[PDB]
Amino acid sequence: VTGGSLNFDVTVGSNTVSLAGVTSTQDLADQLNSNSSKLGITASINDKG
Amino acid sequence: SNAYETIDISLQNASASAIGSYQVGSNGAGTVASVAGTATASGIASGT
Numbered sequence: 001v002t003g004g005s006l007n008f009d010v011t012v013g014s015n016t017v018s019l020a021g022v023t024s025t026q027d028l029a030d031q032l033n034s035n036s037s038k039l040g041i042t043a044s045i046n047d048k049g
Numbered sequence: 050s051n052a053y054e055t056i057d058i059s060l061q062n063a064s065a066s067a068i069g070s071y072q073v074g075s076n077g078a079g080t081v082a083s084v085a086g087t088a089t090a091s092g093i094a095s096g097t
Binding site (some may be wrong): 014015040 | 066
């Protein structure tokens with residue numbers, strides 16, 4: 001990630017969202033975990049990132 | 050003990066996600082809403 005954010009769309013089955021502010025592994029993990037309930041997925045970050 | 054003498058049972062599709070909840074009939078539901086929930090000149094008109 002250099003010079004800007006990696007804003008992208010998240011499509012899972014029927015419901016579909018588009019996150020923003022994608023700059024690192026942890027940021028993604030966090031916003032997906034906040035949004036997993038909507039998408040019906042399980043965003044889990046391990047000790048190794 | 051007779052043919053086709055049965056008991057119908059229609060359990061819910063799921064207690065899972067979105068399919069089961071309050072169904073949203075709202076203003077900006079489809080694309081965008083008219084006078085209801087916005088400013089306008091004439092206002093709420095007639096209708097049935």
